[PDB]
Each structure stands twice: as structure tokens, then as C-alpha cells.
């Protein structure tokens, strides 16, 4: 049981280069409009405290530098929606994949596909945290780098890199440009919302390690939902919803765990620790694997 | 905060077809004018429990062998069997194929693999050899086919082609020349995966990474020989290093001005003694499946 991302292929053939003066990062070729981070225009003396309506008036279309592999694009017009430029170019992605964008919910994750200069190097998958923060993988560079979903062949893009905290956890926004968080795209210390540990997620997660042969940390006791609630929050867990518990059907029903003895599980994990033991080789409990991962991957 | 991170994969994505012999249907790889697949697609289930491949080879023709890219058929014009890998030549050259090679690797190489079923790509993660010669991979039914490769500017390196699971769960395959990794053979027999050991030469570049990060408390003031931390890292189930190894770190060892055998003295200690209650990289455990390319390939911002 691996953290799996989805292929970046269809991502891949959408990835260009945008520089202005001498700001470089990626930006998303769909159809004939690349969205890439606004801050693109900014001087590094601008990111400091940035005006950006001010800012984006002063530029043309000629001060925009749109490179696809070794290939210029002409810049024929551009637009702000938020957080994210829109240049639209005189030629279309014929890669362009069938598309969304989508706003993802805190707990959910998705694929990230991290690029230098146009060109992808990595990806991984993440998860948006209930302090909507994402624990990623980003230096110099990577903004305009976007976070995905691919169901039957059409790319749902999430997620869009604007910026790294002092604490080495990242911020960004869904492709209108709202950020996730409340975070904004200036060079200032900023701090996160205190984080919490996605319940359904270590509970999915607690499945798949039964599905793979491991069951030491079940247990004969039994809890109501209100009950594990209680404890999950004094452990600075999300609750759990009857949403939540549904969600879990599939994963019960194949295991023959109730979700509830699961719960009393998790609590027992939570109350006596994991006492220098392993699940899935992890010391610590996971709550980056959605259901819904667990499912894909285990069946 | 250090993540395990799998090469682009949309290279290897372009490459993927489904080959199916009558009802028995995997994956393979194509590249110029050839599809390269595992041989067990001859084999009806029952074939699987004791199969004479050469013989199973003789009866069947290229009109036997459906290969597909999506729904769409290529002719097979030539078959041949080298080692456990059928080569189907077809009359179509891949237009997506990329620039490269096939490699063997050695225990602690890591490698990116893309899941396939039905030829259709499923997901990608990483993955290390281990030193018992088995993957710690994620494969359902219809997987096999799937591969395993790494990427240098632009050229892949095949390194992996899925076959089977063994019982404790964990996987094995072959080189793109068909040749298991370990002692494992295509046939639905009982095996076993061997004792397995830690790679020593991993951990250490899991250490240097700390070391960057500004995470050092466990640099020690000694050193040792390498012959003198080889003979002591078995006793701890510890791979020994090789030479080769000791060169691969070269590079960390420069960044850090850490010596490597200074940092091999620094792991004995905590084979001995070490951890207590303090973490590396927030972790309790050693980290054994980032090589040293790994972690400069994840600081560094490579293609
Ligand atoms: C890291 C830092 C001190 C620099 C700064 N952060 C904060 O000022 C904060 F603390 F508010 F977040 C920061 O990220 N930026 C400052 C400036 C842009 C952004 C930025 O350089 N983005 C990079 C895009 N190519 C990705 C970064 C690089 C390192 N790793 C990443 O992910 C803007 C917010 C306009
Ligand atoms: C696990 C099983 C008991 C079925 C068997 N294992 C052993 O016989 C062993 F234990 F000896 F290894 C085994 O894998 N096979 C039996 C038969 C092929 C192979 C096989 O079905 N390969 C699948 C390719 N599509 C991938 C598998 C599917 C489940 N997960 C995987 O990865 C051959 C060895 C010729």
C-alpha cells in the first residue's frame, strides 16, 4: 500500500514557461490561455508589498514571455481573475486535455505535478489540510505547478503553487485564483491556522492496513459516533460526520469491521499510543489516503 | 519533511498497450516496432501451474497475439521469446516512443513505477529494489506488464517489468531483457521471499539529507574503516557497502564536508545505542528507500 499519484502525462503536455522582466515560473496551456501565479509581474521589490491592479496596468502584452518547450508563444491579451494571470496566445494546446477546475474541500487530495522553467521534474500526491496548507515538495521556481485529479480521462486541476511558509508547508490557490487559506501572495511572514489530523482519512487508512494482513491494533470495544467525537476532538482530530461513516461503507463491508469498531480502534490508538509499533511501516498515523484512494489502490 | 517523489511519467504513459492470448490479457511495453511483454500471456490459467513455455511458444503464430493502444489493433508481424519477456514485433513504430534504455539495478536503486491495467496507465509511485530482490509494490490483477524506469535528461532508463506477487505481499519482475531479479520463476508454484536486510547505503543519504536540513545531532566526533562498519552493519542486518556505494555518496559527502566513513561511524552508533527518543527528519525510524540520487534529485530542481 503505496501513496500513489495519478500519470502527469495529460498534465505534462500542458506545462509552459511564463517570464516577465526577470520573474520566471510555469504557467497551465489550455486551449489559447495559459493561467499561471499573478506575481509573475512583480520586481522582487514588488513582492514585498504588492499592489497588483496598480501593478498589472503598467504591462503589455509584449512584456510577457510565453515559452513552450523551445517554442515562443505570442501573448494577444491578458486578464487578472484573482490570484492568477490569463494570458491568451495566438495558438492553441492541441495536448489540451478534457478539463475542469474544480475547489477542493479540506481532506481531500490530489496529485501534484512539480515544474521548473516549463519542464516537469516530479509528482507526488498531497493532501489539502484542514488549515489549508499542503505538505508539498517545492523550492525556487515551482510556482504555477498544479495539483490534480483524473477521472476517466478528464483532468480535474485543484490546486495552483504561489508560496511557501516558514514552517516549510505550502500555500496556493484553485485555478480561479482564490487562495486556499488565509494567506495572500505577498512576501510576508505568514502564519497557518493550528492544523488537525483528517479522521476519515486514518480511518480509511486504518482499513487498508487490515486489507493488507495487519490487525493488531483491532480491539473488542465499541463506541457511538457522539463518543469517538469527543475524543477525537480533545486530540485535536476533525469530526466525523454520518457523511463520513457512509463514505466508509464500502470499506467496512469488505473488511466485516464496522465503522464504529474501527472508531474504538482509532481510539485506543489515540489513548495508548502505537507503543513503538508499525502500521503499514508507518510509526505515525496517516491521514493523507482518502477513502476513496484506499478503494482505488485495494480494489 | 522529506517525500518520496516519482518521475513525469507521461513518457512511459505513451508507451503502454494491452496484449491479450485468448482469454489472458496484460500489459506491454512498446518502443519503435516492438511490444515487450511478459511470456506467462501464453499461458492459460491452468498453463500457470506448470508451464513448458518453449513448447507452449511452438503453438501459437503472430495471429494469436492481440496487442492494442487503447482500442485500436497492431499487427503483429514476428514474435520471439527471450528469457521470461515476449517480443512482439508489429508493423506500426511507436511515434511517442522516447529516447531509451534498457538497465539491470542493483539492490537500494530506486525507480518510478506506472501501474497499468488494460494497458491503460493507473497511477505512479516509487519504488526500491530490495536486497532480497523483491518490490515493495501496490499491484492488482492484470497489472503484469507494468514497468518500472527511471529518467536522465530526457532518456528513460527500463529498469523493471512486473510479474507476480509472492505471499508476504511483496513483488517480482524482470529486467526489459526478461531476466528475474532474485531467484524467482514464472510459474504459479509456492515461493517465498528471503530474509531481507536494510539499505545501508540509502540510510546514509537519509542522514546526509538531515544534515542539510540542519539536522545533526548524531554526528559523532569518531570514525571507522569501511571493512571494520561492513563486518558490524551485518550484525544488525545492515547491507555492507560496496565501493561503488561509497563513490555515490561522493557527492553529499562534498556538500556536508561530512567524510562518508565519518557518517558510517556516526550510523553505528545508532545501530548501537542511537535514536533513544529523538528523531531524524521528524521520523523515529531510519529511512532505507532514498538513494543518494534521490535526495539531491528532490534539493536540486533536475528538468
Ligand atoms: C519562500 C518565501 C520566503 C520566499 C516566500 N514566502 C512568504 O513570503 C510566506 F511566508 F508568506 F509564504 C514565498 O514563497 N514567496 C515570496 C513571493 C512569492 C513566493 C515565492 O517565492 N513562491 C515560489 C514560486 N516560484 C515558490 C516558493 C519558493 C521556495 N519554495 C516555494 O514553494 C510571493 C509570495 C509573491
Ligand atoms: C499472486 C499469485 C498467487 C496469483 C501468483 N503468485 C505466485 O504464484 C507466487 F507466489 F509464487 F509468487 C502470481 O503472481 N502469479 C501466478 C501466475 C502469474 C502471476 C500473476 O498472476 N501475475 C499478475 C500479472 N497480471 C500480477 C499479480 C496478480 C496479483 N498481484 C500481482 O502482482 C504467474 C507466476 C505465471
Known sequence: FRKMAFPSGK???????????????????????????????????????????????????????????????????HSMQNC?????????????????????????????????????????????????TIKGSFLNGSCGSVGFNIDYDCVSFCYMHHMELPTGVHAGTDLEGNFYGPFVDRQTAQAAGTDTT?????????????????????????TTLNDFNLVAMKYNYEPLTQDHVDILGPLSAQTGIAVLDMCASLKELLQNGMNGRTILGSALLEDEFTPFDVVRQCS
Open 11 to 77: 498534465v505534462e503536455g500542458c506545462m509552459v514557461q511564463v517570464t516577465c522582466g526577470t520573474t520566471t515560473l510555469n504557467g497551465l496551456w489550455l486551449d489559447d490561455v495559459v493561467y499561471c501565479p499573478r506575481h509573475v509581474i512583480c520586481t522582487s521589490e514588488d513582492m514585498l508589498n504588492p499592489n497588483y491592479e496598480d501593478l498589472l496596468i503598467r504591462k503589455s502584452n509584449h512584456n510577457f514571455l510565453v515559452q513552450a518547450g523551445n517554442v515562443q508563444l505570442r501573448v494577444i491579451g
Open 84 to 132: 492568477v494571470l490569463k494570458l491568451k496566445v495566438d495558438t492553441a494546446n492541441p495536448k489540451t486535455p478534457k478539463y475542469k477546475f474544480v475547489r477542493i474541500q479540506p481532506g481531500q487530495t490530489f496529485s501534484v505535478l512539480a515544474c521548473y522553467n516549463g519542464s516537469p521534474s516530479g509528482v507526488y500526491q498531497c493532501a489539502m489540510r484542514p488549515n489549508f
Open 198 to 222: 483528517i479522521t476519515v482519512n486514518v480511518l480509511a487508512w486504518l482499513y487498508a492496513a487490515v486489507i493488507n494482513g495487519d490487525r493488531w491494533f483491532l480491539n473488542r470495544f465499541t
